[PDB]
Design a protein around this ligand. Structure first.
Ligand code: LDZ
Ligand code: MG
Ligand code: MG
Ligand code: MG
Ligand code: MG
Ligand code: MG
Ligand code: MG
Ligand code: MG
Ligand code: MG
Lengths: 212, 196, 233, 220, 203, 52, 222, 195, 195, 196
């Protein structure tokens, strides 16, 4: 798995792969690794499939309840802290989650929290998480820029998950793209690596390690 | 340890060696492994001495309570109580116990309760480290309905041989006789049983 | 039970046209010591069920008592306990299966393999297996432990598929069972020559045969087997 | 694997199933487990397949040299001593388990042999994962003084028991018949009771279905 | 275990007067893919050998067999046949019984004299899979078995055999994290050998 | 899925019972009944617009 | 040392059609090298046009199917016999499984049925509750053999239109129930050939708007 | 751990190797050159077990120089890398294996081409447009998969390495104390002082 | 691993804490502030097990603020450090111990003195002129044993920390991504942006 | 396994059960554990079957070589050769071997060689898993100088009882009789010995 979120001038890009594995068996290539908690808040899933799907879905419930109770959407900080507080209660039980909680409120602005099953919660401008995180980093970091156009950012995110899908045995499938702004998230599609890789190799003239 | 109990024509006889070891050290050379839990219901002990003493103690308590409330408990009932304690606490006991009793209807009875807490009614039973060596001997020499004297001899011969081969057995041979006439304690010394 | 001490080996069984047969030897082993020889491991529940048990004999005795208790309980305020509202093999099975899976799931198994044999009220044969893991299955033949490996292949030659059942008589099934018992005595180091057999028949009811002995053995040829290769005398 | 041996009034019969397994997978569905040590001495193997085959060849080679050297027909007992001494020397680490059968100038013989070097002799034997199923048949139907045709039937029934009841075994029956005074009679696929049914369709692809990046002729 | 560190697969199939043998292109170190061009199929005269497993042994065995077959050709004055090479591979492997090469070799070829298609497989210590419809090997061997037993039928023309062995390899590979990243296919007849590079997923 | 409106209503009433024995046998949660009532309004796919 | 888990072999197979779904399993049950039964069904009609198989450790599988069927019973009690929709069944099965996250049912669960638009549905679960809706899925012993085959034949993966230089995919197409059964039968005969834990019998449950129907096919018994 | 990188461009091969030497909680040295020249157009960088790396590299160097003198001819990069591979394959199954991974940059004066070989301690060898040993490949391979072109000048290769090293200083957990960069081309081997 | 340093000078206590957060072969962050303010004149820095450090520090902070509000009075550094110590001593023998080491810098407004407390996860507490957690003490303690004077100004304390951090960047094996420095004195707590 | 050898008035008799197991599977129900290493020098085998076959084989070779060079070897000499092989390779053998012979001077002799390779000359010897159960029986029933018939009976009774209690014993009872008159092989079937 490879997941990434980053803040830039035009808000937040979120990008994930869609591969799930058991040992060296490719179990699926169509897994949805982003959860849409509400129209302003996204979660990403890395680590244990069940651990992630279950707890982020539950986090969604806690967020809604907060909204019913306080008559306002929960903040990114507080939503990520619900998840962090929960996993920490289980610390040592063997949960396996590397997650990002991403979104917008007026108070905070575009906001990203890294949250894992160790209890680690971090605010930040850039995170890559998963078995393919280093491959995403190497590409994303090299070409990252605060003043990327929205288009260039969407592409850089896509290109970074693509780099990870290629090199990490355990990443692949397709790329799922999101942009988050002050008006919330917007979906930018599912991009099968099967056709994406070749298209990018041609357009870009990259991936020269490969026989074409 | 070498313990046995043998039904016969008039009741039942319990026998045991008197050796308790820790390592190769004989911590007690005159142990009394023949333990009373009711008037004419007794038991033979093998295994952990802490465990078998602790078990017999609690069984004696249960049968005392039984007696004041319900009347005389049967030999079977005593075996039931032992079994319940041995089976339920199987993961934390090392106890190999023979329960033996007299009553006017059945005369003598014998119930062996091996490690694990199962229970088996038998015309006779042998147990303890030393019994392995006398399986063949006891099988070939036991008859139903022996006299008291024939039965004493069988046990004397049996336990003498088990003591001969088993390092964990030795000392004196103890016997308890349960009949209508009451409870009789016997003892035999090495210089007697070692010549048989 | 965390590990078995006194144990019974194979229970074996098969369906035939009008009922079921089940058999188990009378031995309670203690490691490699053939310790007890009159241990009954077939347990009749009412007139329609026989529960055969292998494994830890302490746990078997505990299950026996559970079964007697069922019989007792079922009769309370039950005017038809000997009739319409008697225990069915299927009730006895479901209960045991529930108990075995519960004990597995508390990490404290009843260390047994069990076959439940009987005839349901509509006359249907009942034959189903459960063990210390809570694993369950039916088949026209069932056998536990060692018997699964040698009795099953013998018994399946008689009832190989469901359709063989109505073609199979008690007489034929009983012969198959007994032969398998002889074979187990030949090759299972923890078997005894003495065994019990029970037939449950939709017409004739329960027939419980105690003290069978393995008979008609071949040892003849042994006189001619000498050395282990080159030795001639 | 299921292998058996059965003596009869005038020789010995050997038989095997034909399934070889990489774990729970079947690599070869029609494998050959009946090996020749010499023209009238044949063996069937279970255990580690490479060891079973290698040790077969080693002894076969040596038995042949021995036979040429001594100008004598190879004797089953010679294969026996050579094998067990070799297997013992290796202390079990050559995981060969074999039933060896044969006829020679001294008569007809039947032996089993285990990885550690121990050997048995009898009138009927079985080895491999399916040996309990096979032995149940042998113990039910063997009798002294079998004819050839009866020993073939019995051995073949025994392999079948393993084929049907042992997951380690399957597919076909192979037999070899070694009769005194005759050429060894090797019957490959004596029984073939497990043919795949016809598939529901052909999965032939239209030509051009598969994408190619580049193509070239190779020169041998 | 050593046989799954580098990843990769090989499959060979018989057809009518042809044989085919195929492999992926991956060389990785656990989850890290490293080489996009590591072929696993070699040839000595008209005999083809594919090898899966530990890459260093793949390379070593190749050199060992080029060495052995070259000497064979010199001494025998003719090139080695697939049947003979098969035995050679077996005994070479067994020679290392107690310290084996961590490999799963596969032989394919057409006997120059019978004109008969030949394939075989081996376990890491030389046991021969005499089977003659298909042979599979590598970290996706389960997948390959499944694909072959499904797609295969006997006496395919070379053009059809090409589609079959391609689809078997491609689909098996895409369900394996340690295989893929490209492929090559050889279609082998008496007078012609065609090598092809397949287009596949790059994840 | 969405909770059916009647279910929700039934659920609030079950809580209301908790000055005594619960609908599933639970022990009491409070020492007196509530002194309030509710009009519950909603929509679901099975019974459309409902008022309880 | 008590091991609470076992492996009973078996293989299962779910494929969704446009207006139907299919859930197939073999009927063989195993322990190590032995056959416990040649016919012990493991695909079950749970009501509401929902069929289910929990494959692996059969004791956990049975327990899980039992708990789920019970879950339906109570759903009906609580909601005046309201149909439990398949997506709702799936989310519920997620919770049953994750409830035992620290002592899991050692099984692979598949369920099949129709969605709220009457289209075939398959859902696949890992032992602790992770799930997705899929078009096809194999599970259990021979899944690693059968799944790539389904990828290729149900979803036309790696097939291109000839003459297009491998640039135009073979377009996705809904298969009929006839064509699906053919694939199911061939998958299993193939699994039976190469996997020792597969054989004896093939039971297929077919779900449509009109209900659940069953077909049975023999498989080789070795 | 040690960074060992290689990029093969149009007219040269470029090797970059970290300067740190670290034991326990002490950086012992920040100027360590992790290469030996095997011949005038062949360079080998090395990472791995303490002691093994220098012992192995010098043994190879001694042997290569011996051949140079005996034949009055410089073996090709292809020939040298194969000798190194074989030595490692013998090693891995010997009584004491060298735990050394290597990169070999060479300029083939006959083929007039740069070649770059990655060989690990098992004797796994592969020729690559770019290579790396250790954890560094987890960042550099994807980066170069994106940025590397086949037509590139030496200067571009250098820029490519500036990108890699910048990333490793950003994301690698250990302070590897910079790199020494060496260029192997038709004129031989030189070190880029201004890196 | 995490650098956590403290120097107590004449008129203030100064805390320095590394900015890196590292998991596996990835530096996740280079700007992480490893402190919570417990009260206006008391600061606590922290190192240790993932999750435990923030969970512990915030729990303490919440409790300290609660006391501030309940009593309308700010507990002394001595009182706060003792509460922290006790919480750790209970921890170490509880079912799940916090694996957290801490430094507490505080200005006692009553005694008009800076105080610095080093407390590890066992509940070991000591007051010191300078302190450190982790491997850093292996270099800083001897350095300050040489350079530290009791009469020093805040600025001198700062120079002292420049010396320590310079040494750790030289000799520590991991890239800890610099430090954030905070000064606790009579006017409260402030961060030195120009460090 | 249950093996014994018993000196008597005219020579020596070897006896054994015929069961070989692996796990609870009886791999051979008619094993011949009575192994000849010279004319009137034989042995009983217990322990690893590979080990005891391999040992006896090499001992037969040594005594064949002995005979062609030096003449008839003594029973003692055979026991010496076994001992040397068992003791020197103690770390890699599981062999419990009884050596038994006849000659005109000593008549019958018995040497038991337990695990470890020590050697003990005895008027009789029992060994193998099953012997534990018959220590007491054999001690009480063995006499020196029994007749052939009395000796056959002793062994039949002894091994019958060992087979009764030992899962690792069973099958038929094999006997070999070594005297001046030569070598005689006997066999007894379950239906005979199980009734004793
Ligand atoms: C959101 C995830 C799908 C992200 C993805 C990678 O990060 N994770 C995964 O792919 C992980 C593997 C990874 C932990 C090494 N896989 C998983 O989490 C899979 C679920 C799929 C196979 C459907 N579950 C699993 O691996 O086995 C769980 C288990 C639990 C108890 C007993 C037996 C088996
Ligand atoms: Mg004594
Ligand atoms: Mg494989
Ligand atoms: Mg792949
Ligand atoms: Mg990938
Ligand atoms: Mg619904
Ligand atoms: Mg099969
Ligand atoms: Mg089979
Ligand atoms: Mg016996």
């Amino acid at each position: 798995t490879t997941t990434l979120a980053f803040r830039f001038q035009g808000g937040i890009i979120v990008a994930v792969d869609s591969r799930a594995t058991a040992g060296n068996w490719v179990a699926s290539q169509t897994v949805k690794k982003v959860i849409e908690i509400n129209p302003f808040l996204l979660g990403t899933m890395a680590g244990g499939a069940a651990d992630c799907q279950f707890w982020e879905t539950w986090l969604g419930s806690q967020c809604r309840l907060h909204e019913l109770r306080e008559k306002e959407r929960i903040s990114v900080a507080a939503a990520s802290k619900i998840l962090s507080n929960l996993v920490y209660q289980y610390k040592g039980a063997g949960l396996s989650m590397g997650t990002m909680i991403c979104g917008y409120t007026r108070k905070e602005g575009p906001t990203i929290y890294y949250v894992d099953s160790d209890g680690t919660r971090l605010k930040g401008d850039i995170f890559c998480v998963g078995s393919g995180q280093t491959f995403a980093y190497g590409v994303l970091d090299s070409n990252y820029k605060w003043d990327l156009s929205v288009e260039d950012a969407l592409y850089l995110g896509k290109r970074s998950i693509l780099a990870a899908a290629h090199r990490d045995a355990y990443s692949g499938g397709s790329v799922n793209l999101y942009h988050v702004t002050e008006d919330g998230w917007i979906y930018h599609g599912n991009h099968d690596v099967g056709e994406l890789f070749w298209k990018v190799k041609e357009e870009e003239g990259s991936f020269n390690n490969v026989i074409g | 340890t070498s313990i046995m109990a043998v039904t016969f024509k008039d009741g039942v006889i319990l026998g045991a060696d008197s050796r308790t070891t820790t390592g190769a050290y004989i911590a007690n050379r005159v142990t009394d492994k023949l333990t009373r839990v009711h008037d004419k219901i007794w038991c033979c002990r093998s295994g952990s001495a802490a465990d078998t003493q602790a078990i017999a103690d609690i069984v004696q308590y249960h049968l005392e309570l039984y007696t004041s409330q319900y009347g005389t408990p049967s030999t079977e009932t005593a075996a039931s109580v032992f079994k319940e304690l041995c089976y339920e606490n199987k993961d934390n006991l090392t106890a190999g116990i023979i329960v033996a009793g007299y009553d006017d209807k059945n005369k003598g009875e014998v119930y062996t309760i091996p490690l694990g807490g199962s229970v088996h009614k038998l015309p006779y039973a042998i147990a303890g480290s030393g019994s392995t060596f006398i399986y063949g001997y006891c099988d070939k020499n036991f008859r139903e309905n022996m006299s008291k004297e024939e039965t004493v001899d069988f046990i004397k011969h049996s336990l003498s041989q088990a003591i001969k081969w088993d390092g964990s057995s030795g000392g004196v041979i103890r016997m308890v006789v349960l009949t209508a006439a009451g409870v009789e304690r016997l003892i035999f010394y090495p210089d007697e049983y070692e010549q048989l | 039970t965390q590990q078995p001490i006194v144990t019974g080996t194979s229970v074996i069984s098969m369906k035939y046209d009008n009922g079921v047969i089940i058999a188990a030897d009378n031995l309670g082993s203690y490691g490699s010591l053939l310790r007890f020889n009159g241990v009954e491991r077939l347990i009749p529940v009412g007139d329609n069920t026989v529960v055969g048990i292998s494994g830890d004999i302490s746990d078997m005795q505990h299950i026996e008592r559970l079964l007697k208790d069922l019989v007792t309980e079922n009769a309370y305020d039950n005017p038809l306990a000997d009739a319409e509202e008697a225990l069915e093999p299927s009730y006895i099975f479901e209960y045991l299966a529930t108990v075995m899976y519960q004990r597995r799931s508390k990490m404290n198994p009843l260390w047994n393999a069990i076959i439940v044999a009987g005839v349901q009220s509509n006359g249907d044969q009942f034959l189903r297996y459960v063990n210390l893991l809570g694993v369950t299955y039916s088949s026209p033949t069932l056998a536990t432990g060692f018997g699964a490996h040698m009795a099953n292949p013998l018994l399946r030659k008689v009832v190989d598929r469901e359709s063989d059942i109505p073609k199979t008589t008690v007489q034929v099934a009983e012969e198959a069972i007994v032969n398998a018992m002889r074979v187990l005595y030949y090759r299972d180091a923890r078997s005894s020559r003495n065994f019990s057999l029970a037939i449950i028949d939709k017409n004739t009811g329960l027939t419980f045969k105690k003290n069978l002995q393995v008979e008609n053995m071949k040892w003849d040829f042994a006189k001619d087997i000498k050395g282990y290769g080159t030795q001639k005398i | 694997t299921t292998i058996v041996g059965v003596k009869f009034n005038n020789g010995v019969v050997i038989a095997a199933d034909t399934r070889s397994t990489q774990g729970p997978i079947v690599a070869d569905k029609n494998c050959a487990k009946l090996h020749r040590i010499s023209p009238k001495i044949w063996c069937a193997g279970a255990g580690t397949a490479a060891d079973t085959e290698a040790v077969t060849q080693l002894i076969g080679s040596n038995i042949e040299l021995h036979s040429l050297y001594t100008s004598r027909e190879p004797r089953v007992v010679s294969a026996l001593q050579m094998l067990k001494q070799h297997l013992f020397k290796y202390q079990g680490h050559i995981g060969a388990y074999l039933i060896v059968a044969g006829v020679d100038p001294t008569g007809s013989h039947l032996f089993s042999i285990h990885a550690h070097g121990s050997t048995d002799v009898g009138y009927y034997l079985s080895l491999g994962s399916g040996s309990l199923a096979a032995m149940a048949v042998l113990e039910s139907h063997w009798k002294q003084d079998l004819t050839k045709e009866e020993a073939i039937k019995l051995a073949s029934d025994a392999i079948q028991a393993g084929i049907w009841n042992d997951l380690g075994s399957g597919s076909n029956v192979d037999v070899c018949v070694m009769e005194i005074g005759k050429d060894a009679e090797y019957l490959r696929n004596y029984l073939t009771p497990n043919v795949r049914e016809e598939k529901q369709k052909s999965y032939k692809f239209p030509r051009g279905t598969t994408a190619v990046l580049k193509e070239s002729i190779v020169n041998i | 275990d050593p046989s799954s560190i580098n990843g990769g697969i090989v499959v060979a199939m018989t057809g009518k007067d042809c044989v085919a043998i195929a492999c992926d292109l991956r060389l990785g170190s656990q989850s890290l893919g490293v080489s996009n061009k590591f072929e696993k199929i070699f040839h000595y005269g008209h005999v083809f050998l594919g090898i899966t497993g530990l890459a260093t042994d793949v390379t070593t065995l190749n050199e060992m067999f080029r060495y052995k077959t070259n000497l064979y050709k010199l001494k025998e004055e003719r090139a080695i046949e697939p049947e003979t090479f098969t035995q050679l591979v077996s005994s070479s492997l067994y020679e290392r019984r107690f310290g084996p090469y961590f490999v799963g070799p596969v032989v394919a070829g057409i006997n120059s004299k019978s004109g008969k298609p030949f394939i075989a497989g081996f376990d890491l210590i030389g046991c021969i899979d005499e089977a003659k419809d298909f042979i599979v090997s590598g970290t996706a061997s389960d997948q390959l078995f499944g694909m072959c037993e499904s797609l295969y039928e006997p006496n395919l023309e070379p053009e059809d055999l090409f589609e079959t062995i391609s689809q078997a390899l491609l689909n098996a590979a895409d369900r394996d994290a340690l295989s893929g990243w490209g492929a090559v296919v050889y279609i082998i007849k008496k007078d012609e050998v065609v090598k092809r590079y397949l287009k596949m997923r790059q994840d | 899925e969405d909770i059916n409106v009647e279910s929700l209503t039934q659920s609030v009433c079950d809580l209301a019972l908790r000055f005594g024995e619960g609908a599933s046998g639970e022990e009491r949660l409070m020492s007196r009944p509530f002194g309030v009532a509710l009009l519950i309004a909603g929509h679901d796919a099975d019974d459309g617009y409902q008022l309880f | 040392q008590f091991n609470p888990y076992g492996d009973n072999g078996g293989t299962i197979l779910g494929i969704a059609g446009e207006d139907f779904a299919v859930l197939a399993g073999d009927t063989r049950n195993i322990t190590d090298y032995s056959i416990n039964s040649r016919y012990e069904p493991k695909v079950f009609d749970c009501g509401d046009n929902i069929v289910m198989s929990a494959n692996g450790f059969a004791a956990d599988g049975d327990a899980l199917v039992k708990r789920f069927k019970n879950s339906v019973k109570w759903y009906h009690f609580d909601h005046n016999d309201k149909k439990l929709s398949i997506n709702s069944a799936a989310r519920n099965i997620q919770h049953l499984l994750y409830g035992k996250r620290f002592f899991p049912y050692y099984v692979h669960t598949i369920i099949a049925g129709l969605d709220e638009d009457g289209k075939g549905a398959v859902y696949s679960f890992d032992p602790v509750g992770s799930y997705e809706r899929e078009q096809c899925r194999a599970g259990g012993a021979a899944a690693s053999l059968i799944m790539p085959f389904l990828d290729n034949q149900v979803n036309f993966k790696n097939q291109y239109e000839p003459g297009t230089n491998g640039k135009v995919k073979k377009p996705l197409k809904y298969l009929s129930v006839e064509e699906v059964i053919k694939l199911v039968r061939d998958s299993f005969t193939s699994a039976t050939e190469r996997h020792i834990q597969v054989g004896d019998g093939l039971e297929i449950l077919i779900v449509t708007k009109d209900g659940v129907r069953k077909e049975f096919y023999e498989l080789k018994r070795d | 751990m040690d960074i060992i990188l290689g990029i093969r461009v149009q007219d040269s091969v470029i090797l970059a190797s970290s300067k740190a030497v670290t034991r326990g909680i002490s950086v012992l040295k920040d100027s360590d050159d992790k290469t030996r020249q095997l011949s005038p157009h062949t360079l080998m960088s090395f990472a791995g077990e303490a002691g093994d790396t220098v012992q192995f590299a010098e043994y190879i160097q001694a042997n290569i120089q011996l051949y140079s003198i005996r034949e009055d001819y410089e073996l090709s990069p292809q020939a040298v890398s194969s000798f190194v591979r074989q030595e490692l394959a013998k090693s891995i199954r010997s009584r004491r294996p060298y735990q050394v991974n290597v990169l070999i940059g060479g300029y083939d004066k006959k083929k007039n081409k740069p070649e770059l070989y990655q060989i690990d301690y098992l004797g796994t060898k592969v020729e690559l447009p770019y290579g790396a040993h250790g954890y560094s490949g987890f960042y550099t391979f994807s980066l170069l998969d994106h940025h590397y072109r086949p037509d590139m000048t030496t200067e571009e290769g250098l820029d490519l390495l500036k990108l890699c090293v910048q990333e490793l200083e950003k994301r690698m957990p250990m302070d590897f104390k910079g790199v020494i960069v060496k260029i192997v081309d038709k004129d031989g081997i030189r070190q880029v002082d201004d890196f």
